[PDB]
Design an enzyme around this catalytic site. Structure first.
Site, PDB file in Angstrom:
ATOM      1  N   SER A   1       0.817  -1.195   0.000  1.00  0.00           N
ATOM      2  CA  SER A   1       0.000   0.000   0.000  1.00  0.00           C
ATOM      3  C   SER A   1       0.862   1.261   0.000  1.00  0.00           C
ATOM      4  O   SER A   1       1.622   1.491  -0.943  1.00  0.00           O
ATOM      5  CB  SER A   1      -0.923  -0.038   1.196  1.00  0.00           C
ATOM      6  OG  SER A   1      -2.112   0.638   0.883  1.00  0.00           O
TER       7      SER A   1
ATOM      8  N   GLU B   1      -9.206  -5.342  -3.876  1.00  0.00           N
ATOM      9  CA  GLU B   1      -8.483  -4.196  -3.342  1.00  0.00           C
ATOM     10  C   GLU B   1      -9.398  -3.134  -2.758  1.00  0.00           C
ATOM     11  O   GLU B   1      -9.051  -2.473  -1.764  1.00  0.00           O
ATOM     12  CB  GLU B   1      -7.627  -3.568  -4.438  1.00  0.00           C
ATOM     13  CG  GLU B   1      -6.488  -4.448  -4.910  1.00  0.00           C
ATOM     14  CD  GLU B   1      -5.301  -4.478  -3.927  1.00  0.00           C
ATOM     15  OE1 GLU B   1      -5.403  -3.886  -2.838  1.00  0.00           O
ATOM     16  OE2 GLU B   1      -4.263  -5.099  -4.241  1.00  0.00           O
TER      17      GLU B   1
ATOM     18  N   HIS C   1      -7.570  -5.658   0.778  1.00  0.00           N
ATOM     19  CA  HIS C   1      -6.331  -4.919   0.864  1.00  0.00           C
ATOM     20  C   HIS C   1      -5.597  -5.162   2.190  1.00  0.00           C
ATOM     21  O   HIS C   1      -6.141  -4.895   3.276  1.00  0.00           O
ATOM     22  CB  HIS C   1      -6.728  -3.453   0.755  1.00  0.00           C
ATOM     23  CG  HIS C   1      -5.592  -2.504   0.563  1.00  0.00           C
ATOM     24  ND1 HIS C   1      -4.991  -2.310  -0.661  1.00  0.00           N
ATOM     25  CD2 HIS C   1      -5.003  -1.630   1.414  1.00  0.00           C
ATOM     26  CE1 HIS C   1      -4.048  -1.389  -0.547  1.00  0.00           C
ATOM     27  NE2 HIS C   1      -4.033  -0.962   0.703  1.00  0.00           N
TER      28      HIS C   1
HETATM   29  O1  LIG Z   1      -6.507  12.030  11.508  1.00  0.00           O
HETATM   30  N1  LIG Z   1      -7.057  11.017  10.732  1.00  0.00           N
HETATM   31  C1  LIG Z   1      -8.298  10.939  10.574  1.00  0.00           C
HETATM   32  C2  LIG Z   1      -8.831   9.848   9.744  1.00  0.00           C
HETATM   33  C3  LIG Z   1      -7.977   9.065   8.965  1.00  0.00           C
HETATM   34  C4  LIG Z   1      -8.509   8.051   8.179  1.00  0.00           C
HETATM   35  N2  LIG Z   1      -9.827   7.847   8.187  1.00  0.00           N
HETATM   36  C5  LIG Z   1     -10.379   6.773   7.375  1.00  0.00           C
HETATM   37  O2  LIG Z   1      -9.460   5.709   7.535  1.00  0.00           O
HETATM   38  C6  LIG Z   1     -10.102   4.495   7.855  1.00  0.00           C
HETATM   39  N3  LIG Z   1      -9.607   3.439   6.971  1.00  0.00           N
HETATM   40  C7  LIG Z   1      -8.912   2.411   7.491  1.00  0.00           C
HETATM   41  C8  LIG Z   1      -8.433   1.390   6.669  1.00  0.00           C
HETATM   42  C9  LIG Z   1      -8.681   1.437   5.299  1.00  0.00           C
HETATM   43  C10 LIG Z   1      -8.198   0.366   4.385  1.00  0.00           C
HETATM   44  N4  LIG Z   1      -7.307  -0.445   4.768  1.00  0.00           N
HETATM   45  O3  LIG Z   1      -6.804  -1.481   3.977  1.00  0.00           O
HETATM   46  C11 LIG Z   1      -9.411   2.512   4.798  1.00  0.00           C
HETATM   47  C12 LIG Z   1      -9.858   3.514   5.651  1.00  0.00           C
HETATM   48  C13 LIG Z   1     -10.667   8.583   8.928  1.00  0.00           C
HETATM   49  C14 LIG Z   1     -10.196   9.607   9.731  1.00  0.00           C
END
Ligand SMILES: O/N=C/c1cc[n+](COC[n+]2ccc(/C=N/O)cc2)cc1
Ligand SMILES: *[C@@H]1O[C@H](CO[C@@H]2O[C@@H](C)[C@@H](O)[C@@H](O)[C@@H]2O)[C@@H](O)[C@H](O)[C@H]1NC(C)=O
Ligand SMILES: O/N=C/c1cc[n+](COC[n+]2ccc(/C=N/O)cc2)cc1
Ligand SMILES: *[C@@H]1O[C@H](CO)[C@@H](O)[C@H](O)[C@H]1NC(C)=O
Ligand SMILES: *[C@@H]1O[C@H](CO)[C@@H](O)[C@H](O)[C@H]1NC(C)=O
EC number: 3.1.1.7
Lengths: 533, 535
Positions: free
Chosen positions: A200, A324, A437
């Site tokens: 990734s 994915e 993924h």
């Molecule tokens: O400060 N960060 C805030 C934030 C970051 C990311 N997200 C969304 O991320 C969640 N997420 C986790 C794993 C994946 C896929 N993983 O393979 C996709 C999205 C929300 C808030």
């Protein structure tokens, strides 16, 4: 005091821990400082090499995880928590880990350097799925992994400024790489055979080391699993990092110097709290603070750089998993969840496309829909759900991967491509998500060899195969088993034949064309469609 | 009279007719050929709507075909059977408004379902007297009453100055409708049932059929329809009023010609002069475009075929529609560099992109690029065999297959019973090269029963298969359903629906049911391409 667990590196002496792997012992040297703690006035700044230390430094335990967001969507669910920080969070996080066989190898041994993903906002080298003991014990590998700064701390850029130049989390990686060149022979590693591998964001980072000249003197081969430097999510323009960095500054109440100085006064969670509020649109598979096209680390866009690069004496292994985009749907797209089959309507599919391809105009999103709809079964919920995942995976991983593979092959690199198609028997996500993924990593790292983990004996045999391809790749640049005959052989990927292989529980199968028709849509047509709105 | 065969003498509204006893393989048929249905559209009646034929005196001889409407004669391959079979086979004349009737011999006991054929030929050519349209086998074998009419083509049938009194356009369609009115009034005299009339035609003839469905005053004149490799919707079958006006005034300029003055001067021009310049008026270098075609006049066609199919009510109607396996191949050899009947026509990638511009002449650069990207096989983007077959498919899909699928869906969604087929059998007697597969028009000899003529050299299998297709066509005419009512052991032919999208293969093997007529690709042409025109 075990003579095998004592190492003199350039900065001074270290003491490792003998760990137990199923086949016998390995030596682990965990939590080694490779930079000065990037704390205080060093926030947002390139890392500096770690000053020497007196005495014997205790390298028997994992160090702190870089300051990052902790996931909250499914509290206490293994499928999500397995990626969550498993040590204390700190900005003081610039440490690396080394596993070697025990006793430490007699001759110089190929080195594998792992760079985790996490969207450039998360991750840690301490996660169970990156456990290096198996690769070290079974394959004889010297395995390395570093923490690098993620989120605002790694990638907040005010381009052209002295105090937030951007790309520092990638300089953290480059520094650990340099550390390996200077120090790895002491552990029995061969600095003249270094292979980068990552999944990734780790894979895109690996891809940026391929594209950045100062990195090129620090490794020989690269593996990119499910990520690429090119594509819609892995970089941003200098103008757009400036926008997001100055937006975050407004959100926490903050002349570049003035602005950066004030951001440095802010507690770490204050930055993280507002990290997600700076994205230009409602999206999925899109991350706020990521490597910036600075004209320095990255002298042009990854697209420009892969189109004109000369990759003469480079070997690359690339691939994708079967599904994915599924994982990403549950985090932004209405109608999707792990807690049911997620059978969507047509209306939810059109809405989901605007979120999965946030950069799309009306016409372009309609072209996406008209392409991914099954016109025999236009309103079928199962098809529509699977197509949505396909949109997200194709746009974000498979088609960038196909575009990179082809450019590298054409420009004189040696390329091997795969699709990983086996769903872990122990997977906690529902069936509809398929092989999501990240879910090849545990197999490549050899986790099924741990009997207490409850994998089938078939998956143990399959792990042993994958560890072999990956380390044969590190040793020789060719993942094929030089002792095995009728396999069949895994052929190099080329622009003519377009051969890749399926990694699953069945023996290797050679296929041609990685979503060739669909990726032509994404890689060739769609750009022409947007660039005329 | 008194010496003649008593069964060949019939009276119609215009007077007395003498027909001919013809020999069909299984026995004799009655034929009444060259029956005038209009006043000769000549002199000051050029470009004018037809007027009903004034009654004649005495017994009109109806024993031979009449004149073919004035038209272009094809010259690409002079002497070649594949082209000559479509060329005029009676004298060319503007005096051409005649029709033909075949019936059983002796004429049927009880009122018999009537099939009315409308020939293809791009609206610039055709004749009802061509060998492939011979009604003798349908009449003899199926007991059918078969009618086919000459209609005006080219400038004579379709040159329009929309709004004018002197050239209102669509008059070639008006000839067809007049012949449909002639059948209502007169077909009972032959044993034909005017309350069971079925139109069928191929290519422009099928478009014609489709326009009678869309045109109100035609609706009372027929009951069911067959559209073979043609539709009134699509890119070639009509032009706007503005475009017709543009083409008519250019042609006029070319032959040296207020609308009254312009037309009065066209009427002073020799027929051959108009023909000599008709192809000179198309807006781009193109194939499957024809200069003078039905015009959206707001009269015969109250609106575009697209608007009318999308919003029409087709309640009391049954339609059979279909396509041949290789609609586009025939069109390539007349206009795409790199294609010939005399070699394998393997083309380069460059020759492909140039061909797409010619086959899709209305496309912008973005649209052409969409077509090229969709039809390219990206595993083998430069393979000359694939590029050849892709080029044929572009043309076939754009002009026929996708228009047909669009029509079937609209019709079925809106009340009509619809049956759909793909014709996949290539005549053992075809003179076109193998690469062209099963070209446009090469199902017609099978529907018409030609393989039954033992002097034509078809296989026994082909004789059997021809007989099968004539059963379907005539069962459909009889009952609005191609399926044999008694014969349940035969595999059935389901109606086409929007839900299941079912159609059948027509080849030497028993009917096989398939789903979705090029569903993915026709979504590109029917749903996406229009939207890319708007930019
Ligand atoms: O400060 N960060 C805030 C934030 C970051 C990311 N997200 C969304 O991320 C969640 N997420 C986790 C794993 C994946 C896929 N993983 O393979 C996709 C999205 C929300 C808030
Ligand atoms: C196939 O034919 C195309 C048309 O050329 C014509 O027919 C052939 C037999 C020629 O010899 C010439 O006399 C005619 O003009 C050609 O454009 C094409 O190059 C031909 N394909 C190949 C590769 O032979
Ligand atoms: O006056 N007419 C001139 C003219 C008309 C047509 N053309 C080219 O059309 C010849 N052609 C014949 C048959 C076909 C397809 N038949 O299925 C395509 C093209 C050239 C000149
Ligand atoms: C699954 O759950 C989500 C939200 O919890 C909901 O929107 C969706 O309708 C559910 N899926 C199905 C199968 O209906
Ligand atoms: C068909 O075959 C016959 C008999 O062999 C041959 O002499 C004749 O020329 C052919 N006729 C046609 C219609 O081609």
């Amino acid at each position: 005091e075990d003579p095998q667990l004592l190492v003199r590196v350039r900065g001074g002496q270290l003491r490792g821990i003998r760990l137990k792997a199923p086949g016998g012992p390995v030596s682990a040297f965990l939590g080694i400082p490779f930079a000065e703690p990037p704390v205080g006035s060093r926030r947002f700044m390139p890392p500096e090499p770690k000053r020497p230390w007196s005495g014997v430094l205790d390298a028997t335990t994992f160090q702190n995880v870089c300051y990052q967001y902790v996931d909250t969507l499914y509290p206490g669910f293994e499928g999500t928590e397995m990626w969550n920080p498993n040590r204390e969070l700190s900005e003081d996080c610039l440490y690396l880990n080394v596993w070697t066989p025990y006793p430490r190898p007699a001759s110089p041994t190929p080195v594998l350097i792992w760079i985790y993903g996490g969207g450039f906002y998360s991750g840690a080298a301490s996660l169970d799925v990156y456990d290096g003991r198996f690769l070290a014990q079974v394959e004889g590998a010297v395995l390395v992994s570093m923490n690098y700064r993620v989120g605002t701390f790694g990638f907040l850029a005010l381009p052209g400024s002295r105090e937030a130049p951007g790309n520092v989390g990638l300089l953290d990686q480059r520094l650990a790489l340099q550390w390996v060149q200077e120090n790895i022979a002491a552990f029995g590693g061969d600095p003249m055979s270094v292979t980068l591998f990552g999944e990734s964001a780790g894979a895109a980072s690996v891809g940026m080391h391929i594209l950045s000249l100062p990195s090129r003197s620090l490794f020989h081969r690269a593996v990119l699993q499910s990520g690429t430097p090119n594509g819609p999510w892995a970089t941003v323009s200098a103008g757009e990092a400036r926008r997001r960095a100055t937006l975050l500054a407004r959100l926490v109440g903050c002349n570049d110097t003035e602005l950066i100085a004030c951001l440095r006064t802010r507690p770490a969670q204050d930055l993280v709290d507002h990290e997600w509020h700076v994205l230009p649109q409602e999206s999925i598979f899109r991350f706020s603070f990521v490597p910036v096209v600075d004209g320095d680390f990255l002298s042009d866009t990854p697209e420009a750089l892969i189109n004109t690069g000369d990759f003469q004496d480079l070997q690359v292994l690339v691939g994708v998993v079967k599904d994915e985009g599924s994982y990403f749907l549950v985090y932004g797209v209405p109608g999707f969840s792990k807690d049911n089959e997620s059978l969507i309507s047509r209306a939810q599919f059109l809405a989901g496309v605007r979120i999965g391809v946030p950069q799309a105009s009306d016409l372009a999103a309609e072209a996406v829909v008209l392409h991914y709809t099954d016109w025999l079964h236009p309103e079928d919920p199962t098809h529509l759900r699977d197509a949505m995942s396909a949109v997200v995976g194709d746009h974000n991983v498979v088609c960038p991967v196909a575009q990179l593979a082809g450019r590298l092959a054409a420009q004189g690199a040696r390329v091997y491509a795969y699709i990983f198609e086996h769903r872990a028997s122990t997977l906690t996500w529902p069936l509809w998500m398929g092989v999501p993924h990240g879910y090849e990593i545990e197999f490549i790292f050899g986790l099924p060899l741990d009997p207490s983990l409850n994998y089938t004996t078939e998956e143990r045999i399959f792990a042993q195969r994958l560890m072999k391809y990956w380390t044969n790749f590190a040793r020789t640049g060719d993942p094929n088993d030089p002792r095995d005959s009728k396999s069949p052989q895994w052929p190099p990927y080329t622009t003519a034949a377009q051969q890749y292989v399926s990694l699953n529980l069945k023996p290797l199968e050679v296929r041609r064309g990685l979503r060739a028709q669909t990726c032509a849509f994404w890689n060739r047509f769609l750009p022409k469609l947007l660039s005329a709105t």
